Structure formats: C-alpha cells, structure tokens
C-alpha cells in the first residue's frame, strides 16, 4: 500500500467527491456499505482472486464482483476473448455470430430452455420474464419469496384476506403493487394455501432456487419440487432466477442440482464474462411470444453486443472443463469449515450453507433454513468481523443477507490465508 | 465479398440457427427487418464508417451501433481506452473512479444534472427516471408522446373523458396502463388541454425533445418552451430522454440546443462508447431520493462498470474537441441535400429534417412535423430504396420511422459515394 505507517486516503478523497455526484456517492446501493458502516474502498484492479484498492491494498475477494468471477478476475482466456472481439468494434446494432453460439450453448447446457433472449440485466431479465408469464397466461397475479430479489423492475418492489401486496418503495404504483404475492421462503404450507386460495390467478412463481439476497439459503428437500407441481397443476409458469445460481451450483444450474425443469428461467452474472448481459429462456413455443415472433414486446439496443458474448462464451467455455463444479464445490466444503472451526475456537457461534460454488455465514447456533432465522442472525457481530477481515486482507459480501463466492482462483495458499485471517477476525468481532 | 459471382450465404445460415434459439432469430426486434422485408445480415466486425458483413460485403454505415459510435466505428482512442481498462479486470462489484470522472464530466457538460446515477440501459434509466417522478411529486400519472420510445418498462407499453391508458403489448397490467397519458408530439393545444383537465395528478412529462422513435421529427419552435411552462405551473417534472439526442444534437444535448432546462435526463449511446451503459440524471435534491441516500429503490449490479466507463469517457473526450458538433452538423446537411438532389434528379418526393448530428429522410412532399405525417409517407417507396441502398453498400436504419446518424468517420469522399449510391438506388425504388 502507498502508506507504510489499511490507509484508505484515496479512497476517501474520491468518496467524497463520489457523493456529491452519485446518490450516496455509488451507482448500486450495497456498495456504499451501509450496512457494515464506514465508507468502501474504491478499486484500481482486480486480478485472480484479488482485488486491489486505490491505496494500495490487497484484498482475497469473496464477492467476485457478485458472481461473474468464477474462474477469478482477469482470468487470461476471458481477457484474450475480450481483447480479439474488441479489434471487431465494440457494438454493431445488428446480429453477430457470437449471439448464435451464446444460444446455443446456454440451451445446451441448461435443456429447460429451447429458446433463449439476451437483455443487459438481471433487472431486464425479470422484468421480461414476468411479462412473458402474465402475458402467455393471461393472468395478472406474480408470486415471489421474502429474501429473494430479482431487479428493480417495479412488480417486485413489493411485500405482503387476499394478501395484496403494497409498494416498498416510493414511486410503484400501488395498484400493481396489488398483484405481486410474497410468500415465506421454504414454507410448504403456505404455499399451497396460497394456490388453494388464488392459483387460478397467479400467471407466474419466480425464486432464486438457492436463495443469495438473503445470505446463502438452500431449498428444504422437495420443496422446489412442491413449487413445480403447484404451479402445473394450478396453469401457473414456474421461473426460476437463476442469475446468481446459474453455471455456479452446478454447470447445469440450480435446476440441474435439484432435478427441476422451470417454465422460465433467468440468467446473468457468469453469462456476461464480468461484462453487462442478462438473458431469459424456456421453451420454444413460450419465448415464440416475444417480439418480432409474438406480440410481447421486449427490446435492447445494445443486446447480445459482440464482446460481451466473447466474455461469456469464454469463461462458459471454462466452466465445462471436466470437474470443475466438483472442484470449486469442495474448496467452498473447505473455507465453509475452517471458518466453523475458527469461530469455534473463538467461541463465537456461527453456522454456514454452502450449494457448489456458493456459500453462507450466519451468526447463529441455528442450521438456516428460513428468512426468520437469516434475520435473528447476530448482525453486529457479523459487522465487526466483516471490518476485521477488512483489516485482514479478505473482503467479504458488506452484508449480512449476501451469498459469497468461490472461484477457481481460489487456490490452497489463498483458502488457507483467509482461514488464518479469520482465526483472528473472529476473536476481534467476539 | 467471398463469392465473386451481395451474396448472403453467411447470413442466411446464421440466421436459420437463430431462428430456432432466438425469438425471431434476434436479440431485438428491429434487427430482424421485418418493416423492410428480407433477411438481415450478420456483422463481422465495424471500422469507422463502415460495416462488414459474414460475406465479406462492406457498408457506409447510418445506423452506427444505433447512436453510440459519433466518432465511428473502432475509434483507435476509444479501443485504446478499452484495452487499458480490460487489463484491470472487466467489472469490480464496487466503486471506482472512471464512475466519479464521467459522473463529473456528464454533469459539467449538461449542467441541469447537479447528480446522475449509472445504470445498464436505456429502459433502465427510464424506468428509474419515471419511478424518481412518481415518488418525489407523489402523483401517479405519466405523460409520454406518441411515437417517442423510452425502452421496454411496462409504463411505456401503452396508447390512448381521462383518455386512460392501455397496454399495447400482452402482460401490462390494464390497471398500471391507465397511469400513462398519451398527447402528440408537437401538439401545442393537446398538452395544454390535458394539463388543465388533470396536471395537479401528472407526476413527470417524458419526451425525446427531438424525436427520432418515428423518423427524426424536430420541435416546432417554442414547443419545448411550452412543455416546460406547463410542467413547472403544474409541479410535474419534466423528463427529458436524451439516450439518442444526447451528445449527438450538440455537445449539451437538445436541452442545450433549445435552451429548456428539464427537471430529469436519460442518458445512454454515447455514453457508453459503444457498451451497455445508461443514466439519469438532474437536480441534487432530487436525485437524493434515490437509495443509499434516499427511499426510491433503484440499483445494478454492472453499473458503472470500469470497461464502460473508460469506452464512454474517451468518446466524451473526443467529442469536446472544439468545432465537433459544427462539422457533423455541416456533414448531415451536406448529406441531407445531396439525398434531396438524387430523389429530384429521379422524379421522387423526398423530405428531410435533422438537428445536429441526426437526421431524417421522407418520402413525401410535407415538411414533417407531426406523426401524422412520418406515418403518411410512402413506406413501399421507402423499403425499395432501404434494399436498394444495401445493394449500393450503404446501410440506413432498416425502418422509415429511425433517425439516421452521422459520424466523424463519415468523411466527404464517405459522403460522396453515398450519394452515388442514392442517385441510382432512388432511380430504382421510384
Ligand atoms: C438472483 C438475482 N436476480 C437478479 C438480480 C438483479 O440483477 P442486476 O443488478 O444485473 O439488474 C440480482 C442481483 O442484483 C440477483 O442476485
Ligand atoms: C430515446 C431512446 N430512449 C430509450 C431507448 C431504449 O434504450 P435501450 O434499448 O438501451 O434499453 C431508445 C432505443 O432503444 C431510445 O432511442
């Protein structure tokens, strides 16, 4: 770092500029780190499993950018990739070849979807999707989960005779407020109640399968399962979020791992090799719904653009390497029990869940099956260890309700320093 | 070309695989040429004003990425730019400075931004704006004009005692359709007769203050003046889109040009340099309701991405050269008359309008200043000439209701040989 006597000096100098500037001096809310308080540190680079700040300091980074990063920052194919497209020109407008071989091997590995369209979000994504449910049914109500977020589309912007959902935000009409449905992640029974009570209404069920907007937690055992035969039975579509979830649980998605074929099914993060790329998919006769094929409209001017299908062809490329999954599932089996064994130590309750290559830590003596026991977490204690880390070298997700992220850069040396480094930030945060 | 004996072969086989994996082959809909006919072709690669197809076919280019690329195709600073930032790692998941530098430079440049917010896309950026107006004014309804287009968000998916909304597209909500009004776009008498029977209800007004959604139609003058009188008599904000007029009309965008100052501004195109990126933008006190700092939610993962930023700023920079906005004007009209020269010399009626560095070309005899006109042109005439222009190598929006755009790339032997090509492509579609 600059400084030799954790300086965050320029950070701070370009913080403060940021906020006048920027609501809040960021352009994403979380990053302004409001939640663990302090200011964030702004970033000069990012390389293999590291991040590397404006003052000079070195961070081991579990949060990969939320996801993108499987194979690690900068990973050389990706860069290769990016920097041949980038000779082609930036954006055409116009179709590329690479649009083609995106589609084909998203449909490829994920059967659900026979028909893919690439958007520049996980937020325009969602937002399609949920069109495509409403307008392929004909049905108005939508269906979500407390904990999980899919965008800032304003359908989702929304919580709890009817249980008509209201707006959590200023500026979302309370009338469609009204046709957005929350229910309790994991709960079995209030899922049926709810079919029992509307199902004939309700034009589409989205989750994140695996829920990461609440911390790390996994579905209970056939409970997605349960999701999938209500919404055919009752004629609702079944959309599975898997912007965060998917070519990480496992190559195939949440749905793979748990033996569920979705209705429709959203992509991002991995998919866009770091760069800005959503997608949403299912089968062909559904997505024929949408514009220029059918009449639900959806568009983007700079949609499938060329170098983020290079960036994403080629880390999709990298995660089909033979035991990749395997291999990224057991050095998250590995931080997640170092970390148990060092808070153990400390005598510091903590408990974690962990599906492929993503993770969670819960300040609780509970095994989190529920957005309830997310929230009776221990969350300042989860703070002053986030800041302990900090000082330790390891950035972790800045909040208690966010999943982290195991990459392939993740190697022995580097596991093994954030154990290290967590032996002493659970006995700084006891 | 590949072939020796406009060969599409390429194309053609790209195209079928798409059409099986995305909707219509495409990733958005206008790419797919179903207003002129035909099959689209694929891009290879971009290089100042030219396109190169799969086949080998090169053409002089006036889409331009659909706005983005001012200084052309494959800009040596802009790629330079680009290739330096990829090599610090394509996206962080948290601030860096490229963000703090173009939210300066977006805010010295258009000046009724005190504070602008980075998001993904156009229809990020309007959807955020509109649910920014509802949650400050507390009102509900939306003004927009017919031909203008803001992106995918479900408020703008709809057409006209109260002249309620309805969806144009299947899944929008009937009930969130009601809250978006439609006037006509030049309209002086509609907009005051709407403001006088429901402006203390209207949240924010959202216009392309030159439209190019429905071939470029410039104001009538004091027509914008008339808009923001209305809007500040009101207490409605006046949203300005500047996605396609912004850094393209003039340095300042169409506010500047006109001189109106609007309450709101989207942003996008240019201002990515080619990548995905949009904003919003306006007063701080204003944009202070928008999460961290304030309780508006809006947010994004990619947002202010660093490959984006560093695209964006050194086209910014490039466009500030002094004289930049008088020479592309110069060269648009230059173009403008040569295009109403051919179609004379060839017995056919043509019109143009343009501002700045976009531009319109009609087939009528009227001056177009109204909807009603652009949709009264001879659109058969139009498509002929679209598919005979190809033939010639150049490229128009395949579309007679997109503005077409001028680049610093477009130089006078560029502009020459499109004019050759108009002399016998209008002879051909007369
Ligand atoms: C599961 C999931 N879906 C959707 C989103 C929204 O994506 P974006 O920020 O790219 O709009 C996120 C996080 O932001 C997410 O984790
Ligand atoms: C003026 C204007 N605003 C918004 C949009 C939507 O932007 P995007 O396609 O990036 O979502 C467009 C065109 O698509 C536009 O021309």
Redesign the pocket.
Known sequence: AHHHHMNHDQSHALFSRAQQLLPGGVNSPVRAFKSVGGEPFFVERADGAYLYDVDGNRYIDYVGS?GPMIVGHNHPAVRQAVKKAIDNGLSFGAPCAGEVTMAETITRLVPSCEMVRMVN???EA?LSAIRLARGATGRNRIVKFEGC???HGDSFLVKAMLTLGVPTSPGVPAGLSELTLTLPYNDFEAATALFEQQGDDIAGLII?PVV??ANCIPPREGYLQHLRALCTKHGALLIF?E??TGFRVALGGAQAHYGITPDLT?F?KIIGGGMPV?AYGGRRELMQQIAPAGPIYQAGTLSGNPVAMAAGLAMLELVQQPGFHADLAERTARLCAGLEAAAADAGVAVTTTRVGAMFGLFFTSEKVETYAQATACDIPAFNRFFHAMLEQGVFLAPSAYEAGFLSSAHDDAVIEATLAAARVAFRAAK
């Open positions: 939320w979000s996980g937020t969602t977020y899919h965008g994140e990461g907007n979020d912007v965060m959203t991002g959503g």
